[PDB]
Design a protein around this ligand. Structure first.
Ligand SMILES: [Cl-]
Ligand SMILES: [Cl-]
Ligand SMILES: [Zn+2]
Ligand SMILES: [Zn+2]
Length: 232
């Protein structure tokens, strides 16, 4: 199927895209600094339940995400993981919590969300504090590749489907800039990408934080973009 773009997704709405069996992305149109763009998260079937990766940025959008999941899939979301502390990825956690979803993040993410004044996932994910750390979490592996887009950023791999979701640590091909780098670690980002390459060389589908999916070429693209920004 054609991957949904901002022209299929009005502001405040959410669409799902089935990447593979029991794996979807969720896509929401967001507004920022004069522009609009499509933000991805992930949904992974976990027996007869669903694991959500990342909110849809804010209470209203995350409610709309839960509705679209019920419409298109119809299984209960029982757990959610936020991949870093920024408002776009934890904004909407209170809605998930109120709807009975167990919300998770690393202690690193929880700490930085609190400092920032953002919503804070309730449960803490142990075993991810050091670069290269990985932990199993139901139908996914969570991986802390090192600092990149942020110091806490996690990536998520679905072994059954060979899908890698990079959140904002991986850029789509149409991105030329490094994105919001206020909290990034530019010096460590290319090393962190190399850890991802080394761990998941078998990945077939790579989902960037924003925009169009691709393959492992997205990792090299991301390092190219990051180098360009470093050498500005
Ligand atoms: Cl730990
Ligand atoms: Cl588990
Ligand atoms: Zn961010
Ligand atoms: Zn490129």
């Amino acid at each position: 199927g054609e991957y949904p773009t901002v022209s299929e997704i009005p502001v405040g709405e959410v669409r799902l895209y089935q990447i593979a069996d029991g794996v979807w992305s969720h896509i929401a149109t967001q507004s920022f600094d004069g522009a609009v763009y499509p933000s991805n998260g992930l949904i992974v079937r976990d027996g007869d339940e669903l694991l959500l990766i990342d909110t849809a940025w804010g209470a209203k959008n995350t409610a709309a995400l839960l509705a679209e999941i019920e419409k298109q899939i119809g299984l209960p979301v029982t757990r959610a993981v936020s991949t870093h502390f920024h408002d776009d990825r934890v904004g909407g956690v209170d809605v998930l919590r109120a709807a009975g979803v167990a919300t998770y993040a690393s202690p690193s993410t929880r700490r930085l969300a609190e400092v920032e004044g953002n919503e804070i996932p309730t449960h803490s994910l142990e075993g991810l504090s050091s670069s290269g750390d990985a932990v199993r979490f139901g139908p996914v592996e969570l991986f802390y590749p090192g600092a990149a887009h942020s110091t806490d950023n996690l990536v998520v791999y679905v072994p059954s489907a060979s899908v890698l979701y990079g959140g904002c640590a991986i850029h789509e091909l149409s991105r030329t800039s490094a994105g919001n780098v206020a909290d990034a670690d530019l010096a460590e980002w290319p090393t962190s990408i190399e850890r991802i390459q080394q761990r998941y060389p078998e990945a077939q589908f790579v989902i960037p934080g924003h925009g169009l999916p691709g393959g492992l070429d997205l990792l090299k693209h991301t390092t190219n973009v990051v180098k360009a920004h470093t050498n500005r």
